[PDB]
Amino acid sequence: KNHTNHNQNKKAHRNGIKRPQKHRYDSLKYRDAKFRRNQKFANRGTVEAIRQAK
Amino acid sequence: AVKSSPYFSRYQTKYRRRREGKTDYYARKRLIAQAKNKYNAPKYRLVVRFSNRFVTCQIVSSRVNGDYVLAHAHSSELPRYGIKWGLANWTAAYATGLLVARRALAKVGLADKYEGVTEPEGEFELTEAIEDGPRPFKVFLDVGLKRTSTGSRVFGAMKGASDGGLFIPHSPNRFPGFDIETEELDDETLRKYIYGGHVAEYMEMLIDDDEERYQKQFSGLIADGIESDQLEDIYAEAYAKIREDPSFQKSGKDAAAFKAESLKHTQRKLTAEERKERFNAKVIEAG
Amino acid sequence: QNPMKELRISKLVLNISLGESGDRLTRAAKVLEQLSGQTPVFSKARYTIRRFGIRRNEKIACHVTVRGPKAEEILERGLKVKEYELKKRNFSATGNFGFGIQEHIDLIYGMDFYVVMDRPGMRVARRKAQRGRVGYTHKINAEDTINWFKQKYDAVV
Amino acid sequence: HSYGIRARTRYTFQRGFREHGQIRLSTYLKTYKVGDIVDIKVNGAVQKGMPHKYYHGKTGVVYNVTQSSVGVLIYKVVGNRYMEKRVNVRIEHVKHSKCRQDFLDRVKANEAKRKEAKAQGKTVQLRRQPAPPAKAHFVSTENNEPVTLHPVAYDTTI
Amino acid sequence: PDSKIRIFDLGRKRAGVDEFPLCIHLVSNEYEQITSEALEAARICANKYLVKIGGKDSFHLRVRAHPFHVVRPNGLVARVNIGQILMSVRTKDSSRATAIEALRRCQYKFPGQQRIIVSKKWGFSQYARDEYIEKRSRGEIIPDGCYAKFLNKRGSLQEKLDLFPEASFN
RNA sequence: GUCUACGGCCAUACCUAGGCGAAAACACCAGUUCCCGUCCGAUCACUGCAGUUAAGCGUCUGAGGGCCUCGUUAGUACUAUGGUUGGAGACAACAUGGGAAUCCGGGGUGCUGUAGGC
RNA sequence: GAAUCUCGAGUAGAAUAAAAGGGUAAAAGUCCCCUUGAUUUUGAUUUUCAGUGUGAAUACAAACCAUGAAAGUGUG
RNA sequence: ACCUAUUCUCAAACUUUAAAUAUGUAAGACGCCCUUGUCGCUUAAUUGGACGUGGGCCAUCGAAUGAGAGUU
RNA sequence: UGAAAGUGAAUGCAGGUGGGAACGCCCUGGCGUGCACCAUCGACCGACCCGGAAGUUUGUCAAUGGAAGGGUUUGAGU
């Protein structure tokens, strides 16, 4: 037999169709470049202003 | 047959305003589509429309439920500022565009910062921004189905609005007096159109050549005793009046009173009991 | 009758179809030029016919459209040639009519007149913005054209 | 087989009957933020930015916003795991999920009930409950006398 | 391939709707197939018997199974459901026995099982005998060749008036 | 309430015939020097208000065509599950569930947002 | 109906390089005008997929331009 | 040759319509409400957008049922 | 780190953020505190693409040299 999809769904579910782990922070890299640039500057000022307030 | 019942069944109608021939949705899509990364920033549009007797200039933003008008000025409001005649020409379009620009800037809060040109000399200029201040209120022209030829009144309304302080991106490629070959704008000719000159030489030629046609075309001006020379000063004074007091004055007509008056003229939809009563009455009389 | 319903000659089209190109087409062209005082239009062949040796987009016929008093006076001379006599078949169901004249010396080449009729208000159909359909009560019939023909020119159909 | 991008898309990318023509403009007048849950419905008229036929009818969360498109993150079963698929889809092929809006409306209502319960000093059960079995009730026979029925004899209608 | 059966209506196919009230159907009792050659052989048998007994003017016969299904090209067959009508004969009330026996003999030309059913509807129309009588009585039925036009509440009024003058429009 | 500009949903809005429309508006309309474009200012561009509501436009009417909704079709066709059910089979019945479409009949014939004019 | 253009209707019944399918009516079709986004440089995605490669494609970012009155569109 | 109202019977690459079964997503504390900070992005604009601070709500904490779950 | 010539790793408590072992304090939580590990935003080093301030002498006008600074590229880095 050249092709069949008989036992494949069983093999999938034995270890389950597992989901990727959920993370609070996803890469701001791999996003829009203009947004990434400004968010770097916005983040940099935010952490400094938190530090100054502290 | 030509128009069969299957034809009416499979017929798909264009949109209402496309059927009415009032909206070019191909141009509207590009005029109102805002970049999604700019989110809820509206995209203001200067709609310029011309009737047989008046000019309507509006500033409109687009929303999901419908369009919203920020400012407006109708050429019927020019008699308040002195312009009583020729309320639909190139200069009337300029005056309405100037009035719209002043009203929008007053409502926005930028009138005292972006005055535009007080004495328009016909030079092509864009409202430059303030280095340490807010950017000029940006509005984009909407010509509708009017063809965009050189010297068109739609570009006249833009030039007035641009001179009023609004930032309308444009080029002098369509202003009157602009030569296509040399790519140069004739400031004197544009100033002539701004102050209503072209009509003035038209009265001058008609007086010289055909007095009868002069009487027919300019019956209002002749009966009101205004010559070709007064046009420039009248429009200059009108521009000054517009700038000093651009506010819109609401009419005092009683909407409720005229609604009651027009309800009598508006015929009613008849009842279903009347439907059956006329029906069997027609059956009886027909046998 | 409402004065807005009066029939006026919208346009009058002069057409000369020779079926061949070259000097004959060009000399036929300036005959329209001298007749109408306007630059004629060269019509390109719609289809390729090997029987007639015709290639597509080749110049075969020349036509012009005249409006206003010049169209009216050219109609006057054409009707005088035809002695104000036209057949019943000559009027379109839409209300238009036309006739061909064998020889142009009396105003050699034969050529066709065609008179397009309208009523003031047909701009609604011929404009761009808010274009609409002319109402049925405003449309022109063949009988109406024949009448307007008869009372205007005292002509017999 | 042929394995093109739009293979076997005759019925799914086809425009609906009497729905052809020009795309409505409320599509462009909509705003999308990252985190928005949106449905994908490929509009066949707009060929640019069309996601693959797998994503038609798939719902995901917005992760990126550009001038003319939206980045949607969808979990696609590949063998034995869900893999994160980030399709750049034009806004014409996108619509807001009414389920999310229904959830947000329910959240606003729940907060409102909680505030009024706290103000009144009462406790309000905010969990939805499945449809319970019907309550005991009386059925009146007045002017509704039962009609005794019998199965009808077999007959040949045609 | 060309179907063997070509004629599908025999007898007085121009007979009026009121003239032949009785309708008798040969109905398939099984989910099966019928070949075109089988259909024409039964058609010939039905026409031959009916013209021999009652003559050509005593019946209208309509074979309703059309050989449209191709079998794999060599020929055509008629795919038939359960309860689908195969043959129909409309006659007077007197020719009931003749039509029943004619369909009984034509059963032997068809594979599988068939039932002969005397339809309670008037002729080939969809209306039962009682409602056809009553609608014809109050005037909404007008004969039109081999069929009849029925007045419907839709449409204009004057056109329905001058086509149906006896109709009582309440 | 009517009208104009810009719209949203995109026929309840479309197509056809007939009857109305007071104000304002709109439209038709006069003209070709100017900007501009044509074989032809008819289209487009520009200047204007001498007339017309004839058309466009609004609205009313037709047991109009279409369209939209409700019921009928009909718990029908179809269908998930079940049986050491029936039948040689084709197929059918039953059990626990889901559940249409055409014909047909009734009703309906645009609603609404912003800025204004009357 | 005039010795090829004329006006009526005309939901696409035509065209869209090439197979077939989808899309297209003030266009995506037909004519005209100006052009070379059929460009340079990254990364990110989609599809076949092992989420390797190749091929084809999508959304952008940094320049440089075309075009348009403008919105905008254009990386064949 | 047609045209009009009808009529019998069909389609695997015809179709307005349109299931059952399958299929996607959501069903909150990485929540909600208020205040307020950074940015070279965005806006006519502290105007937004993204990320935050400081507070308040705070396990019936937002359907049922059942399981400890996950990654190298 | 780059093919090489060559250059060669702290703005900060060797940074922020999220979750987190163990501990402490308070009345089950809360509050601190955060090892290890991941998600992520940066900083630094080398290539790559710009940018050429000193400085060196030899051609000073130059030759050579590479600083600051910018890319949102890359490395089996700190």
Secondary structure of B29-86 as H, E, C letters: HHHHCCCHHHCCCCCCEEEEEECCCCEEEEEEEECCCCEEEEEEEEHHHHHHHCCCCC
∠ CA(B218), CA(B221), CA(B222), 5° rounding? 80
A-D interface (Cβ pairs under 8 Å ≥ 3): yes
Sorted by sequence, the CB contacts under 8 Å of residue C138 that are 6+ apart come out as C5, C119, C121
Q: Provide the CA E113 to C1' F84 distance, Å, integer.
A: 30
Q: Are C94 and C140 in contact (CB under 8 A)?
A: yes
Contact B283 E169 (CB under 8 A): yes
d(CA E91, CA E61): 9
Task: With CB atoms and an 8 Å threshold, state whether B12 touches D18.
Answer: yes
In degrees and rounded to multiples of 5, residue B73 shows phi and psi of -160, 125
Tell me the one-letter amino acid at A51: R
C131 in reach of chain B (CB within 8 A): yes
E117 neighbourhood in chain D, CB within 8 Å: 156, 158
CA-based torsion, D6, D9, D12, D15: positive or negative: positive
- Closest chain E CA to residue D158: E119
Between CA C62 and C1' F65 the distance (Å) reads 45
User: Which residues sit opposite D96 in a β-bridge?
Assistant: D38
Experimental method: cryo-EM
Residue with tokens 């008849």: B270
Q: Are D62 and D8 in contact (CB under 8 A)?
A: no
For residue A31, which phi and psi values (nearest 5 degrees)?
Answer: -105, -170
Specify the nucleotide whose C1' lies closest to residue A38 (CA).
H41
Separation of B151 CA and F35 C1' (Å): 5
Q: In the structure, how far is the CA atom of residue E113 from the C1' atom of nucleotide F88, in angstroms?
A: 15
The residues of B between 21 and 40 with beta carbon within 7 Å of nucleic strand F are: 22-23, 25, 28
Is the shortest CB-to-strand distance from B257 to strand F under 7 Å? no
The helix/strand/coil state of C29 is helix
- Angstrom distances, CA of residue B209 to CA of B198, B204, B215, B219: 16, 9, 12, 16
- Per-residue DSSP letters for chain B? --S-HHHHHH--PPPHHHHTT---HHHHHHHH---GGGTT----EEEEEE-SS-EEEEEEEE-SS-EEEEEEEEGGGHHHHT--S-TTSHHHHHHHHHHHHHHHHHHHT-TTT----SS--S-----PPPTTSPPPPB-EEE-TTS---TT-HHHHHHHHHHHTT-B----GGGSTT-BTTTTB--HHHHHHHHTTHHHHHHHHHHHHH-HHHHHHHTHHHHHTT--STHHHHHHHHHHHHHHH--PPPPP---HHHHHHHHHHHSPPPPPHHHHHHHHHHHHHHH-
- Closest residue to H4 (CA to C1') is B1
Question: Treating both helix axes as pointing N-terminal to C-terminal, what angle do C69-81 and C23-36 enclose, rounded to 10 degrees?
Answer: 110
Q: Which nucleotide is nearest to D113 (CA to C1')?
A: H62
Distance CA B54, CA B86 (A): 9
Q: How far apart are the first and last CA of chain B?
A: 33
Q: Which residues contact D71 (CB under 8 A, 6 or more apart)?
A: A31, D62, D63, D64, D65, D86, D87, D88, D89
Q: Best residue in A19, A23, A38 to probe D by mutation, most D CBs within 10 Å?
A: A19
Q: In the 8-state DSSP scheme, what is residue C38?
A: S
79-118 in chain D: CB under 8 A from chain B: 91
The span from the CA of B32 to the CA of B66, in Å, is 12
The one-character DSSP state at E54 is T
Is B97 in contact with B194 (CB distance < 8 Å)? no
> For residue C65, which amino acid is it?
T
Residue at minimum CA to C1' distance from nucleotide F65: B5
How near does any CA of chain B get to the CA of E85, in Å? Answer: 30
Q: Residue E165's closest chain B neighbor by CA?
A: B287
Extract the tokens encoding C72: 């009216």
SS3 C137: helix
Q: Is B138 on the interface with C (CB under 8 A)?
A: no
Burial class (CB in 10 A: 0-12, 13-18, 19+), A43: exposed
The Cα–Cα gap between E159 and B205 comes to 66
Output the distance from B144 CA to F35 C1' rounded to whole Å.
19
Six-digit token string for C15: 């057409």
Sheet with E9-11, edge to edge strand ranges: E9-11, E60-63, E85-91, E22-28, E114-119
Amino acid at E64: R
Which among C94, D157, B253, B136 is positioned nearest to E121, based on CA atoms? D157
Report how far residue E161's alpha carbon sits from residue B287's, in angstroms, rounded to the nearest whole number. Answer: 9
Q: Are E88 and E103 in contact (CB under 8 A)?
A: no
Buried b / exposed e across B29-45, counting CB within 10 Å, b at 16+?
Answer: eebbbbebbeeeeebbb
In B16-45, the residues whose Cβ lies within 8 Å of chain A are 37
With CA of D33 and C1' of each nucleotide, the nearest comes out as H49
A40 touches strand I (CB under 7 A): yes
Residue in B closest to D65 by C-alpha: B37
Q: Please name the residues between 6 and 65 in chain D that touch chain B, using a CB distance below 8 Å.
A: 18-23, 25-26, 28-33, 65
Strands annotated E in chain E: 9-11, 22-28, 32-35, 60-63, 69-71, 75-80, 85-91, 114-119, 141-144, 147-150
Beta bridge partners of E147: E144
Residue B90 CA neighbour count, 13 Å, CB half: 21
Nearest by CB to A12, which of D65, D80, D83? D80
Half-sphere exposure of C52 (CA within 13 A, CB side): 14
Angle at D45 between CA D43 and CA D50, to 5 degrees: 55
Q: Where are the alpha helices (DSSP H) in D3-158?
A: 98-120
CB atoms inside a 10 Å sphere around CB B68: 12
Give residues with Cβ within 8 angstroms of B180, minimum separation 6.
B150, B173
> Vertex B145, ends B139 and B151: CA angle to 5°?
70
Distance CA C99, CA C114 (A): 6
Which 3 state secondary structure label does DSSP give E106?
A: helix
Residues 6+ apart with CB under 8 A from E23: E88, E89, E90, E118, E119, E121, E122, E123, E124
Q: Which helix (H) or strand (E) holds D97?
A: none
**Is B283 within 8 Å of E158 when comparing Cβ atoms?**
no
Q: CA E101, C1' H41: Å apart? A: 93
Question: For residue A11, what are its two tokens?
Answer: 């093999």
Q: Which residues pair with B179 in a beta bridge?
A: B184
Measured from the CB, is D126 under 7 Å from any atom of strand H?
yes
Q: Which nucleotides of I are covered by protein (CB under 7 A)?
A: 15-19, 38-42, 71-73
B41 touches strand G (CB under 7 A): no
Q: Are E141 and E148 in contact (CB under 8 A)?
A: yes
CB-CB under 8 Å, B21 with C130: yes
Helix (H, G, I), strand (E, B) or coil at D38: strand
**In sequence order, which residues have a C-beta less than 8 Å from that of residue C47 and are 6 or more positions away?**
C54, C56
Helix (H) or strand (E) holding A29: none
Residues of chain B contacting D68 with CB distance shorter than 8 Å: 33, 35-36
Closest by Cα among B200, B198, B117, B128 to B160: B117
